[PDB]
Amino acid sequence: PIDTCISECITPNGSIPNDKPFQNVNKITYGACPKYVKQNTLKLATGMRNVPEK
Amino acid sequence: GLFGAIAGFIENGWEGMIDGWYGFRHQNSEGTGQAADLKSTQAAIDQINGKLNRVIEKTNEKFHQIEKEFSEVEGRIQDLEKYVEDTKIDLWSYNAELLVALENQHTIDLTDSEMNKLFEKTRRQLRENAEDMGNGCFKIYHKCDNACIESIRNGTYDHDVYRDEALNNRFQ
Amino acid sequence: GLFGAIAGFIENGWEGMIDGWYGFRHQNSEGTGQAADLKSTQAAIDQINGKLNRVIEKTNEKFHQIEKEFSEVEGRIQDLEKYVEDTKIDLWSYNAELLVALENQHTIDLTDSEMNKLFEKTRRQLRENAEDMGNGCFKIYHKCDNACIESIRNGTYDHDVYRDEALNNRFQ
Amino acid sequence: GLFGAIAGFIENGWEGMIDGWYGFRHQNSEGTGQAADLKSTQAAIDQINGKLNRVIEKTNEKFHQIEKEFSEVEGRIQDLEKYVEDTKIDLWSYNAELLVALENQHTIDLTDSEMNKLFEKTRRQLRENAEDMGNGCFKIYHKCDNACIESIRNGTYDHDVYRDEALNNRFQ
Amino acid sequence: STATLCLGHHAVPNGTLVKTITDDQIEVTNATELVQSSSTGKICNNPHRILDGIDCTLIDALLGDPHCDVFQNETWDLFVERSKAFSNCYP
Ligand SMILES: *[C@@H]1O[C@H](CO)[C@@H](O[C@@H]2O[C@H](CO)[C@@H](O)[C@H](O)[C@H]2NC(C)=O)[C@H](O)[C@H]1NC(C)=O
Ligand SMILES: *[C@@H]1O[C@H](CO)[C@@H](O)[C@H](O)[C@H]1NC(C)=O
Ligand SMILES: *[C@@H]1O[C@H](CO)[C@@H](O)[C@H](O)[C@H]1NC(C)=O
Ligand SMILES: *[C@@H]1O[C@H](CO)[C@@H](O)[C@H](O)[C@H]1NC(C)=O
Ligand SMILES: *[C@@H]1O[C@H](CO)[C@@H](O)[C@H](O)[C@H]1NC(C)=O
């Protein structure tokens, strides 16, 4: 269903935010959309190796 | 972990450190104190803050494309469209996997290098006045009060005026 | 070879070393002995054992595709199919070339870093009792029997109880 | 800049250096002199001279392809051709961006590592006769004339015959 | 008689498992998700001129099917074609 909102990327599943570089929602896209990838998750490290006490 | 500082000869992180990423814990006659190193933390954060805008600048803008879902079965043309889309998806999935792996490896090496660089900078300030105990912690061989310690952290540690006392303490 | 340990200041490999990848050769009054360092070898092997499953997880499974060999000459559609297949082949060939080059470079840097890390760990055990001769080999300045050497290799070298004798031997 | 030599503890380049990339500036009783290190410069240049032929070997040779510019509007087949070409262009543009970023990062790390390797090699030649002042410049603790300096640069510095005088100058 | 100066880095109680060139799973202090895997389920009507086609396909609105008379002279950036669309004119 259509909605009153702002979004640059539309898939058949609705609008999605394009802040991330990749998406796993639908390979059919319209607008400034992320690229479709087969992976459901890809974590990018934004910190150091985590070595806790003990 | 190419330099063996983090998870290497430091052997332990500081959950009590919330001021920054890298810092010092000093202990002298007055008492134990802790501080964070702003320069190294800022350098590492600056090198990490982007790191994905520098390869994938942004999202390109696609408006009209081929059909990717089909109801009936046509034959050659539908096969070609399905093949093209599957090829593109596989290639971009590989690009994502490799890019994330490379960026993670470089981030880990980068933070390890920043830790090692801080250690080496500190070691070079304390030319002969201190000895590296090997667990990432320096034993300084003279009266070093809080002004002394904050001079070490500052980067203006004057090694010349403690050289005689330190050398006498070390080699007897 | 980013750290200059392998093919750098070590200058020579040991073909007589079959126990592990990195190890020690000691020489003292009793006689020359050789051993391998299991921790560094295991770390390097662990980091190498995968290294290709972490990017290309596995082979994806493709069943029905386009035709890639043609008998007659049709025109547009055959041209498009040939172009699509050639594009895919070129892109995947480039992916293979770049991936192998990057993995080889990182493997070489990784093994060099492990050698350097072992050297630095050993140097930090021998705080003031030994001097680095520069060819990757330490000169220890006291009676160091086989128990002493196996304590160095163990990582439990007690530097404090040889400090006086070693310092006297060094600085006279 | 993973090792902190260049833009790190060296802190300044030498625009007066035109002989090579890395070199020495010595100052003793006779007077200031400058020379370049040929081995490190040659190593860095050798590692840089290719660096793009090793991934993209050459240009592949393409003769007959699809049409990429269209006058009228056909529909499905033109859409597919446009999509295929746009996909190929985007994938190759990403390949170019990532490749150049990776090569630049590695080149910077490589030159930094060569500077650090030269520094460490020099430091290992001067076992106990010199002290690292921390700004990338060594203080040698004995009469060291131009023959002495050119022996340091040569790699044949005989540390044993200055050890007593240097140690006496250092520790008094 | 002597002082002591340790160096260290911050850690966190719980870390995020990422993947590198040399590790299937390695724990870091922080990590960001790179794949957008969920959707709000609704189509935002800005900045794109969306045209919801109620019961009308694009070709039916084109030909001038009676129950598509509301789509005459329409313009769109994205024509959204519903699954419930049907034809009600000459076959
Ligand atoms: C890891 O980094 C992310 C990104 O900076 C942090 O998430 C943000 O945290 C701030 C904290 O004030 C919020 O204002 C933002 O809205 C958060 N962004 C998102 C996308 O959620 C996260 O907190 C960091 N983790 C740790 C442990 O510091
Ligand atoms: C640190 O050094 C700066 C300049 O070297 C000086 O101005 C300052 O007073 C010092 N101490 C601090 C910041 O506590
Ligand atoms: C090495 O050290 C361990 C523990 O530090 C000890 O149990 C062992 O006896 C030592 N010597 C060996 C393994 O030869
Ligand atoms: C440098 O060393 C080489 C061999 O070690 C020697 O032949 C030469 O005379 C030395 N001095 C130079 C090249 O000025
Ligand atoms: C956070 O840490 C706690 C314990 O410290 C742990 O149980 C939990 O799984 C971690 N993650 C989240 C998302 O709570």
Numbering used by the authors:
A (entry chain C): 273 to 326
B (entry chain D), C (entry chain B), D (entry chain F): 1 to 172
E (entry chain C): 9 to 99
From the paper:
HA is a transmembrane viral surface protein which is responsible for interacting with host cell receptors and mediating virus entry. Three HA1/HA2 heterodimers assemble to form a trimer spike protruding from the virus envelope, with the HA2 and the short N- and C-terminal fragments of HA1 forming membrane-proximal stem and the large middle fragment of HA1 forming the membrane-distal head. Triggered by the decrease in pH in late endosomes during virus entry, HA undergoes conformational changes that underlie its transition from a prefusion state to a postfusion state. Through initial biochemistry and cryo-EM data analyses, we found that F005-126, a neutralizing antibody targeting the HA head of H3N2 viruses, fulfills all our requirements.
We obtained three major conformations of the HA-Fab complex at pH 5.2 (HA-Fab-pH 5.2 conformations A, B and C) through 3D classifications and refinements. The structures of the three major conformations were determined at resolutions of 3.0 Å, 4.2 Å and 3.4 Å, respectively. The HA-Fab-pH 5.2 conformation A has a highly similar structure to that of HA-Fab-pH 7.8 with an r.m.s.d of 0.3 Å between the 1470 aligned Cα atom pairs of the HAs. Further cryo-EM analysis of the sample showed that the HA (strain A/Hong Kong/1/1968) with the bound Fab F005-126 was mostly intact at pH 5.2. In our research, we used a neutralizing antibody, F005-126, to bind the HA head and found that the HA head remains tightly packed upon low pH treatment, indicating that this antibody prevents the dilation of HA head even after an incubation of 30 minutes at room temperature.
